[PDB]
Amino acid sequence: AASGSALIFDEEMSRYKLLWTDPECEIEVPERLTVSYEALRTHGLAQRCKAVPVRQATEQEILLAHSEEYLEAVKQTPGMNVEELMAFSKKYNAVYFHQNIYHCAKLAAGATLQLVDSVMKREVRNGMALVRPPGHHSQRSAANGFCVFNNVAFAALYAKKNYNLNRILIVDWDVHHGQGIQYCFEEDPSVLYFSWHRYEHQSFWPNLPESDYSSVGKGKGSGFNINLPWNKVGMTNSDYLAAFFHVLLPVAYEFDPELVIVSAGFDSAIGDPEGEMCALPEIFAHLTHLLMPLAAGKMCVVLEGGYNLTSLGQSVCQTVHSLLGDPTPRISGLGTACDSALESIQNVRNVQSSYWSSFKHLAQSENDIVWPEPLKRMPASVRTVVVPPPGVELTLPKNCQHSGDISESTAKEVQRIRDKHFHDLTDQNILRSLGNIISVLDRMMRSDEVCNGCVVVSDLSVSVQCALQHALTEPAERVLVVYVGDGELPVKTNDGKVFLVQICTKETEDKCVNRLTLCLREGESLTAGFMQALLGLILPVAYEFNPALVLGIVEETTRLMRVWGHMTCLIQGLARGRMLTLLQGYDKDLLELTVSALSGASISPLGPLRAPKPEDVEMMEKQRQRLQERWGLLRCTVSESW
Ligand SMILES: O=C(NO)C1CCN(CCNCc2ccccc2)CC1
Ligand SMILES: [K+]
Ligand SMILES: [K+]
Ligand code: NA
Ligand SMILES: [Zn+2]
Structure with missing residues (x-):
């Protein structure tokens, strides 16, 4: 039986950055990675994980999720000067390119595949890849929202092909909707995608009608896409846990995945300038813990967003603490989800009642910012x-x-x-x-x-x-x-x-x-x-x-x-x-x-x-x-x- 947790990280992925002024992209910085790894080292968690080397994703692996035309275009960016990189960037929404970003995107994807291999080969119980650029917005032929290639969609497609898995759960707790992942698996019942996200009635980026609770998947994949839109900012620990107890976990345990992959963006944490939510870093200790009895503990956590360097480091540590088995912190002050969250939860449970046995009874009448530093976990x-x-x-x-x-x-x-x-x-x-x-x-x-x-x-x-x-x-x-x-x-x-x-x-x-x-x-x-x-x-x-x-x-x-x-x-x-x-x-x-x-x-x-x-x-x-x-x-x- 497998033991240990992998931690996959390489300083090379901090070696690209924004080269022109753009207030929209200036939050995505190399320091997200270095501050996260240094926080794991400061707390002794990096030392307790099996360090697994990064590698490059191969061309064949990238083509699992992306078109040849898009790959060929991205493959040209290492040879571009700054003017050409700016013009290439402007073909896409909320994304910038750098001479080294193609290199780093192949490392972020390969690091993800290294993690899947380590877990599926029973070399570790679980693990986390601290990577950038993130992936969950990237699409078959487009970069999008800081994302170049879709790291987590790679992971599921790769685990399907090479380990013949029939059921994979993807949990996207980043505060943004991972539409790239949704599109990738829309018709696929073998991959269950769950995303919560700031939506605000479609006024929040990426502003998509299909990020709403009514997109349940398509064709044979109907029921295997679960969107939970947050229609107000300031969601709390109680809102997140209500989402897990009354939507995600009932479906997750019925689906019985053979592998769990987390698109782990910590911009859903207090203090983040993009999310504006209020959940404490300690909640991610519990979101991780509550998923760990699935798939015999085989869980791959993949970093997506998170832009407040302080809440980023603390949330990364709470997650790895839980992957390592350290006792969870106590969460005080919990109570009802707010009305807006109860509305989203109620609407998703109702549209999903056609597909999941835990909801079936609903279908018939018979029925800056400051917060306390997290305590030590020994x-x-x-x-x-x-x-x-x-x-x-x-x-x-x-x-x-x-x-x-x-x-x-x-x-x-x-x-x-x-x-x-x-x-x-x-x-x-x-x-x-x-x-x-x-x-x-x-x-x-x-x-x-x-x-x-x-x-x-x-x-x-x-x-x-x-x-x-x-x-x-x-x-x-x-x-x-x-x-x-x-x-x-x-x-x-x-x-x-x-x-x-x-x-x-x-x-x-x-x-x-x-x-x-x-x-x-x-x-x-x-x-x-x-x-x-x-x-x-x-x-x-x-x-x-x-x-x-x-x-x-x-x-x-x-x-x-x-x-x-x-x-x-x-x-x-x-x-x-x-x-x-x-x-x-x-x-x-x-x-x-x-x-x-x-x-x-x-x-x-x-x-x-x-x-x-x-x-x-x-x-x-x-x-x-x-x-x-x-x-x-x-x-x-x-x-x-x-
Ligand atoms: O974290 C993330 N994904 O997981 C990223 C994804 C895209 N964001 C940028 C979107 N800005 C849209 C915008 C543009 C102009 C005026 C207002 C609003 C940042 C975080
Ligand atoms: K999400
Ligand atoms: K699906
Ligand atoms: Na732009
Ligand atoms: Zn995000």
Whole structure:
């Protein structure tokens, strides 16, 4: 299994620049690259990646996406003087040329292909190419918007040809619409293209009618193009995450790509002069994290735009941190997307409901700038501690560790707790269980030496109490509890400090807005129903709740095995990954699977997802209706005003 992250960069790509005055192009500077790489070096991230050399894309490779006539014209620019370069540039929209730009365009494209090869050959898990010129505007026979050749369209066409992939996802989170990519794959169902972009009702560059939500692709590609137009500036973390939870991720996990390529422009970040959005650099840590359970983690991130040198460096680091597996930062202050974003989200979900099973229920009546520097992200010395039953030895990943050695002081705390709340209990195994929970929780919270952990236990009720109560006093301001099982637990959700997600089998009426109870019909379609609930209900609430600890609980009485790995991976977006899972009873497969996802290993794909049953969808949309007034990140429609 593959490990490591590639970082592909070469100083040569900073060796072209604008040679005449032009306020439109003067923002695209060599320093975008040098400042980004130097920020990765300053934070120690470059040193932790496998440096892979750039190469030139060959003529045959360029012709995958571009016409001979355009290639021949561009091939002439190294021989042009400044006057001739200016006149050549003016044939195109928002683009300038330089004696060295043809050379650099072949390097940006080849660097992208080097990244695809490193990932598809399992030489690294994932990676990023820091390249310029960018690519996503370039078209079959035209340069456009700083772009000469279409780096990301190369990557998908190359991965199709050389690795015979049938399903590729392209996520374009640059603030501009990648119309070059859209045109390239408009009729191709093997490449799913998602783009969000500043649009402002077509008044924002590139001013195209086909950048709107109504372009779903053409012919056999209908449904495999997803445009999400932003019709106001100032979109926030909540707008971006609502886009991911209610549009992109439902489609992404149903499509089940074999490779994910990100057109990663950071002009969608706060402070950028072209985007004018307000999302913090930390959001890209989460956009990256939420895509990583796809395609067994095979993700190629390709730099596009981003023009505020400060937010550019910070956003590049947040992404690579996430590619390397470092704990995600906590995002505070989340809530409802704004009305304009809810309108775009609602319109795209509705036009796409003909094509995607997560939206199908919508079709029938039955239904300068300043911001705080991001905090440091340290990988934990031991990521995951594990406490199997006594005597059970397991082969663990290199970043996991057993931990049964109860201290002296911890053992005094257990005696304390027994005397006070469970005077009538002497089962010395359950009492060892409590020692393990407390000692694991102390390592997780009191230090950056451990990130998360998993304990096998005998008795749920006393285990849950000690875990929850010990976390609350530490103090952890808020705790998210995810419980797979039936019956009530010793959990009080009345003070706002706990949110309880419960996945059960008996339909229990929901009282308060600090509980989400999902009773899913057992059968063939349990997997799709759980994923739909996870992406559209559990993650939105969890992200808004913003817990300091996640507590997972699995009752011994398990169609879990299909989807427990995806939940465990995705739920580490909360609480900087600090999650404690309690497994009742020994189940080797479940224990190994939990430890694997907790430890940052790649998650195996679910396969293309069949459809959820209507009874389950109705159940989930009733939960949304009940909860979205309190938890606004659940909203995916505009609210009715009085
Ligand atoms: O980041 C990017 N693509 O991802 C680029 C793409 C094109 N932009 C320039 C477009 N300027 C249009 C314009 C011209 C004249 C008056 C007003 C507006 C800059 C960022
Ligand atoms: K975009
Ligand atoms: K397509
Ligand atoms: Na021009
Ligand atoms: Zn852009």
